Coordinates of C-alpha atoms and ligand atoms in Angstrom, one line a residue:
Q5 CA -33.8 -8.0 43.9
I6 CA -35.8 -7.5 40.7
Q7 CA -39.4 -7.3 39.4
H8 CA -40.3 -8.3 35.8
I9 CA -43.2 -6.2 34.4
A10 CA -44.8 -7.2 31.1
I11 CA -45.7 -4.1 29.0
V12 CA -48.3 -4.8 26.2
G13 CA -49.5 -2.6 23.3
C14 CA -52.8 -3.0 21.6
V15 CA -54.7 -6.1 22.9
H16 CA -57.8 -5.6 20.7
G17 CA -59.8 -8.4 22.4
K18 CA -57.2 -11.1 22.1
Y19 CA -56.7 -11.9 25.8
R20 CA -56.3 -15.7 25.6
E21 CA -53.5 -15.1 23.1
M22 CA -51.9 -12.4 25.2
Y23 CA -51.9 -14.5 28.3
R24 CA -50.5 -17.5 26.2
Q25 CA -47.6 -15.3 25.1
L26 CA -46.9 -14.1 28.7
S27 CA -47.0 -17.7 30.0
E28 CA -44.4 -18.7 27.3
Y29 CA -42.1 -15.9 28.5
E30 CA -42.3 -17.3 32.0
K31 CA -41.6 -20.8 30.5
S32 CA -38.7 -20.0 28.2
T33 CA -36.9 -17.7 30.7
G34 CA -37.9 -19.1 34.1
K35 CA -38.6 -15.5 35.1
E36 CA -41.6 -14.4 37.2
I37 CA -44.0 -11.7 35.9
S38 CA -45.0 -9.4 38.8
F39 CA -47.8 -7.8 36.8
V40 CA -48.8 -6.6 33.4
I41 CA -49.5 -3.2 31.9
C42 CA -51.5 -2.7 28.7
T43 CA -51.6 0.5 26.7
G44 CA -55.1 0.2 25.4
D45 CA -57.6 -0.9 22.7
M46 CA -58.8 -3.4 25.3
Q47 CA -62.3 -3.9 23.9
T48 CA -63.8 -5.0 27.2
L49 CA -67.2 -5.9 25.8
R50 CA -69.3 -7.7 28.5
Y51 CA -71.9 -9.0 26.0
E52 CA -73.4 -8.5 22.5
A53 CA -75.2 -5.3 23.4
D54 CA -71.9 -3.6 24.2
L55 CA -70.9 -3.8 20.5
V56 CA -72.8 -0.5 20.0
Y57 CA -70.1 1.3 21.9
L58 CA -67.1 -0.1 20.1
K59 CA -66.0 2.4 17.4
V60 CA -64.3 0.2 14.7
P61 CA -64.8 -0.3 11.0
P62 CA -67.5 -2.9 10.2
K63 CA -65.1 -5.7 9.7
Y64 CA -63.9 -5.4 13.3
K65 CA -67.3 -5.4 15.0
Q66 CA -66.5 -8.6 16.9
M67 CA -66.8 -9.6 20.6
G68 CA -63.2 -10.7 21.1
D69 CA -62.2 -12.8 24.2
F70 CA -63.0 -10.4 27.1
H71 CA -66.5 -11.7 27.7
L72 CA -64.9 -15.1 28.7
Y73 CA -63.0 -13.4 31.5
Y74 CA -66.1 -11.4 32.5
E75 CA -68.2 -14.6 32.7
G76 CA -65.4 -16.3 34.6
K77 CA -65.0 -19.0 32.1
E78 CA -61.4 -17.8 31.7
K79 CA -59.3 -16.3 34.5
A80 CA -56.5 -13.7 34.0
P81 CA -53.3 -15.3 35.4
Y82 CA -51.6 -12.0 36.3
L83 CA -52.8 -8.7 37.7
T84 CA -53.2 -6.6 34.5
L85 CA -53.5 -2.8 34.7
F86 CA -54.7 -0.9 31.7
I87 CA -55.9 2.4 30.1
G88 CA -58.4 2.9 27.3
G89 CA -57.5 3.6 23.7
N90 CA -59.6 4.4 20.7
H91 CA -61.2 0.9 20.3
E92 CA -63.1 0.2 23.5
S93 CA -66.4 -0.7 25.0
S94 CA -66.6 3.0 25.8
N95 CA -69.8 2.7 27.9
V96 CA -68.0 0.4 30.3
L97 CA -65.0 2.7 30.7
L98 CA -67.3 5.7 31.3
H99 CA -69.0 3.9 34.2
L100 CA -65.5 3.3 35.5
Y101 CA -64.1 6.8 34.7
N102 CA -62.8 6.8 38.3
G103 CA -61.1 3.5 37.6
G104 CA -62.2 0.0 38.5
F105 CA -61.8 -3.8 37.9
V106 CA -63.6 -4.9 34.7
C107 CA -63.2 -8.5 35.9
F108 CA -60.9 -10.5 38.2
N109 CA -57.2 -9.3 37.8
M110 CA -58.0 -6.6 35.2
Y111 CA -57.9 -3.1 36.6
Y112 CA -58.8 0.0 34.5
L113 CA -57.0 3.1 35.6
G114 CA -59.9 5.4 34.6
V115 CA -59.9 8.5 32.4
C116 CA -56.6 9.2 34.1
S117 CA -55.1 8.4 37.6
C118 CA -52.0 7.3 39.4
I119 CA -51.7 4.1 41.3
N120 CA -49.1 2.4 43.5
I121 CA -47.8 -1.1 43.3
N122 CA -44.5 -2.7 44.4
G123 CA -43.1 0.7 45.3
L124 CA -43.8 2.2 41.9
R125 CA -46.1 5.2 41.1
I126 CA -47.8 4.6 37.7
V127 CA -49.8 7.2 35.8
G128 CA -52.3 6.4 33.1
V129 CA -53.9 8.7 30.5
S130 CA -56.6 7.1 28.4
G131 CA -57.9 7.9 24.9
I132 CA -56.6 9.5 21.7
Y133 CA -56.4 13.2 20.9
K134 CA -58.8 15.1 18.7
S135 CA -58.8 18.9 19.0
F136 CA -62.5 19.2 18.3
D137 CA -63.4 17.1 21.5
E138 CA -60.7 18.2 24.0
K139 CA -63.0 20.6 25.8
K140 CA -66.1 18.4 25.6
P141 CA -67.6 17.2 28.9
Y142 CA -68.7 13.6 29.5
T143 CA -72.4 13.1 29.5
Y144 CA -73.8 10.3 31.7
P145 CA -75.4 7.9 31.4
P146 CA -73.6 6.8 28.2
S147 CA -75.6 7.2 24.9
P148 CA -75.0 5.4 21.6
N149 CA -74.6 8.8 19.9
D150 CA -71.3 9.2 21.9
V151 CA -69.6 6.1 20.5
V152 CA -67.6 8.5 18.3
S153 CA -66.4 10.9 21.0
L154 CA -66.2 9.0 24.4
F155 CA -62.6 7.9 23.8
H156 CA -61.2 11.2 22.8
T157 CA -58.8 12.5 25.5
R158 CA -60.0 15.7 27.3
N159 CA -57.6 18.5 28.0
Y160 CA -58.6 18.6 31.7
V161 CA -56.5 15.6 32.5
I162 CA -53.5 17.9 32.2
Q163 CA -54.6 19.9 35.3
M164 CA -55.7 16.7 37.1
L165 CA -52.2 15.1 36.8
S166 CA -49.8 18.1 36.7
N167 CA -49.0 18.3 40.4
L168 CA -48.4 14.5 40.8
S169 CA -44.6 14.6 40.7
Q170 CA -44.4 17.2 43.5
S171 CA -43.7 14.8 46.5
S172 CA -42.1 11.9 44.6
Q173 CA -41.2 11.0 41.0
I174 CA -43.4 9.1 38.6
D175 CA -42.0 5.7 37.7
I176 CA -44.2 4.8 34.7
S177 CA -46.7 6.8 32.7
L178 CA -49.0 5.1 30.1
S179 CA -50.8 6.5 27.2
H180 CA -52.5 5.2 24.1
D181 CA -51.4 7.6 21.4
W182 CA -47.8 8.9 21.5
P183 CA -46.6 12.1 23.2
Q184 CA -46.5 14.7 20.4
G185 CA -43.0 15.3 18.9
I186 CA -41.4 12.3 20.6
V187 CA -41.1 10.6 17.2
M188 CA -38.2 13.0 16.5
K189 CA -36.3 11.8 19.6
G190 CA -35.4 8.3 18.5
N191 CA -34.1 6.7 15.2
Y192 CA -36.9 8.2 13.1
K193 CA -35.2 7.6 9.8
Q194 CA -35.3 3.9 10.6
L195 CA -38.8 4.1 11.8
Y196 CA -39.9 5.8 8.6
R197 CA -38.3 3.0 6.6
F198 CA -40.6 0.4 8.3
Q199 CA -43.5 3.0 8.6
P200 CA -43.6 5.2 5.5
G201 CA -47.0 6.5 6.6
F202 CA -45.6 8.3 9.7
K203 CA -43.4 10.7 7.8
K204 CA -46.1 13.1 6.7
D205 CA -47.1 14.2 10.2
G206 CA -43.5 14.9 11.1
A207 CA -43.0 16.2 14.6
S208 CA -46.8 16.8 15.0
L209 CA -47.5 13.0 15.2
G210 CA -49.1 12.2 18.5
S211 CA -51.0 13.9 21.3
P212 CA -50.2 17.5 22.5
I213 CA -51.9 16.5 25.8
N214 CA -49.5 13.6 26.3
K215 CA -46.6 15.8 25.3
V216 CA -47.5 18.3 28.0
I217 CA -47.9 15.7 30.6
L218 CA -44.6 14.0 29.8
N219 CA -42.8 17.4 29.9
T220 CA -44.5 18.3 33.2
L221 CA -44.0 15.0 35.1
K222 CA -40.8 13.6 33.4
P223 CA -41.5 10.0 34.4
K224 CA -38.7 7.3 34.2
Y225 CA -40.7 5.6 31.5
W226 CA -43.5 6.6 29.1
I227 CA -45.2 3.6 27.4
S228 CA -47.6 4.0 24.4
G229 CA -49.5 1.8 22.0
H230 CA -51.7 2.8 19.1
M231 CA -49.0 2.9 16.4
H232 CA -48.5 -0.8 15.7
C233 CA -44.7 -0.7 15.8
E234 CA -41.9 -0.9 18.4
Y235 CA -39.9 2.3 18.9
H236 CA -37.7 3.7 21.6
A237 CA -36.8 7.3 22.2
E238 CA -35.3 9.5 24.9
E239 CA -36.8 12.8 25.9
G240 CA -34.4 14.1 28.5
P241 CA -34.6 11.7 31.5
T242 CA -37.7 9.9 30.2
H243 CA -37.4 6.6 28.3
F244 CA -40.1 6.3 25.7
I245 CA -41.2 2.9 24.5
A246 CA -43.9 2.3 21.9
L247 CA -45.4 -1.2 21.6
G248 CA -47.1 -2.9 18.7
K249 CA -50.4 -4.9 18.5
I250 CA -51.0 -8.4 19.9
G251 CA -50.4 -11.0 17.2
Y252 CA -47.1 -9.5 16.2
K253 CA -43.7 -9.9 17.9
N254 CA -43.4 -6.2 18.9
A255 CA -46.6 -6.1 21.1
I256 CA -45.0 -7.3 24.4
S257 CA -41.8 -6.3 26.1
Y258 CA -40.5 -6.6 29.7
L259 CA -39.3 -4.1 32.2
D260 CA -36.7 -5.4 34.7
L261 CA -37.0 -3.0 37.6
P262 CA -35.5 -2.9 41.1
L263 CA -37.9 -4.3 43.7
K264 CA -37.5 -2.9 47.3
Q265 CA -41.0 -3.7 48.5
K266 CA -43.5 -6.2 47.2
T267 CA -46.8 -4.5 47.9
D268 CA -50.4 -4.9 46.7
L269 CA -52.1 -2.5 44.3
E270 CA -53.0 0.7 46.1
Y271 CA -54.5 4.1 45.4
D272 CA -52.0 6.9 45.1
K273 CA -52.4 9.3 48.0
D274 CA -51.6 12.4 45.9
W275 CA -54.2 11.2 43.3
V276 CA -56.8 10.6 45.9
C277 CA -56.3 14.2 47.3
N278 CA -56.7 15.6 43.8
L279 CA -59.8 13.5 43.3
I280 CA -61.5 14.8 46.5
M281 CA -60.4 18.4 46.0
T282 CA -61.8 18.6 42.4
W283 CA -65.1 17.2 43.5
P284 CA -67.1 20.4 43.0
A285 CA -66.2 20.3 39.3
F286 CA -67.5 16.7 39.1
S287 CA -70.7 17.1 41.3
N288 CA -73.2 16.9 38.4
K289 CA -73.4 13.2 37.5
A290 CA -75.1 14.0 34.2
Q291 CA -72.3 16.2 32.8
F292 CA -68.7 16.3 34.0
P293 CA -66.4 18.1 34.5
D294 CA -68.0 21.5 34.8
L295 CA -65.2 23.7 33.6
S296 CA -66.8 26.9 34.8
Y297 CA -64.7 25.6 37.7
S298 CA -60.9 25.9 37.4
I299 CA -59.4 22.5 38.1
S300 CA -56.1 24.0 39.1
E301 CA -57.8 26.6 41.3
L302 CA -59.5 23.8 43.2
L303 CA -56.2 21.9 43.5
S304 CA -54.4 25.1 44.7
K305 CA -56.4 24.5 48.0
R306 CA -54.5 21.3 48.9
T307 CA -52.6 21.5 52.2
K308 CA -50.6 19.0 54.2
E309 CA -53.3 19.0 56.9
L310 CA -56.2 18.5 54.5
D311 CA -54.3 15.9 52.5
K312 CA -53.8 14.0 55.8
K313 CA -57.5 14.2 56.7
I314 CA -58.5 13.2 53.1
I315 CA -56.3 10.0 53.3
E316 CA -57.7 9.1 56.7
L317 CA -61.2 9.4 55.4
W318 CA -60.4 7.5 52.2
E319 CA -58.8 4.7 54.1
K320 CA -62.0 4.6 56.3
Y321 CA -64.7 4.4 53.6
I322 CA -62.8 2.8 50.7
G323 CA -59.5 1.5 51.8
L324 CA -56.0 2.2 50.5
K325 CA -55.8 -1.2 48.8
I326 CA -57.6 -1.4 45.4
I327 CA -59.7 -4.5 45.8
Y328 CA -61.9 -6.5 43.5
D329 CA -65.5 -5.4 43.5
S330 CA -68.1 -7.5 41.4
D331 CA -70.9 -5.0 41.5
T332 CA -72.2 -3.9 38.1
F333 CA -70.4 -0.9 36.7
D334 CA -73.3 1.5 37.0
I335 CA -73.3 0.7 40.7
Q336 CA -69.6 1.2 41.0
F337 CA -69.9 4.6 39.3
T338 CA -72.5 5.8 41.8
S339 CA -70.7 4.3 44.8
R340 CA -67.2 5.8 44.2
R341 CA -68.8 9.3 43.6
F342 CA -70.8 8.8 46.7
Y343 CA -67.7 8.4 48.8
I344 CA -65.8 11.2 47.0
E345 CA -68.7 13.5 47.8
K346 CA -68.9 12.3 51.4
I347 CA -65.2 12.9 52.1
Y348 CA -65.2 16.3 50.4
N349 CA -68.2 17.4 52.5
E350 CA -66.5 16.2 55.7
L351 CA -63.5 18.4 55.1
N352 CA -65.7 21.5 55.5
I353 CA -64.9 24.2 53.0
Ligands
LIG401 MN1 -55.4 2.3 18.8

């Protein structure tokens, strides 16, 4: 038995088109899409005012299609999981830094996280890398002055995700920019023919953050967007696949994976445990994380007995299933942190 997963590069606000293309795959092949994964540049602008938070050159200050799905005039035909890239309504993604549905059937994985679906564990790392911002906290609520920095990947995601392959393997990991160095691990001479511009960065092309995460977790697949080309490479046991941008043939591909269990989208238990145990570092809603705390120090305190109690409490207050919530994003921000704090303080530490 088999599940067909659509993997999509840069959407850049062309949702109707993307879903059209996915429908046409189901038509021309007769195959069923279980769900969709998108590697970023989602541009989930709810309304005109959100344009302030979209860092793009002037010619690309446009609403795109998302607002149609947000309003409910259009309806996403398939469960679509995504991370953020460098072209985003960054204010929206900050409210949902702990993940969340932006509208029916579209689930943002957050700054980073791991989820479960159909027996797979999927890790997402949002953003692109800039050294000058990798140690910068997030300030909340979002300010228009942060349009240039909100989408830069912070280094702390490394310590948040590093222990995730301890109890089982990671099936799929998603990023926006490529893991640094992985360009050398495929047919780069051919890549450089189609993409002359890439040659000058050499092995340093990509994110050192994503490189470390890939090396640490060694997922079956690592999928990236950002670069506007298709590319495949192998870094030991990890299959790397880069996808292009919607509108071009190399934007969408399909993973044909074994399917043992069909099961709804769920929170990952190891992620949840990390989320609760790192709470002290995230306790100041105005500025997080506070790195006077050591993330790995906080996570060194995980135990089997505490993990068990955390999951019991998470199931109680939130549920294991990730379900659609239509509250405004600022409410979802406050609500998820409320329960994270509650669970943490119930553990007694
Ligand atoms: Mn991009």
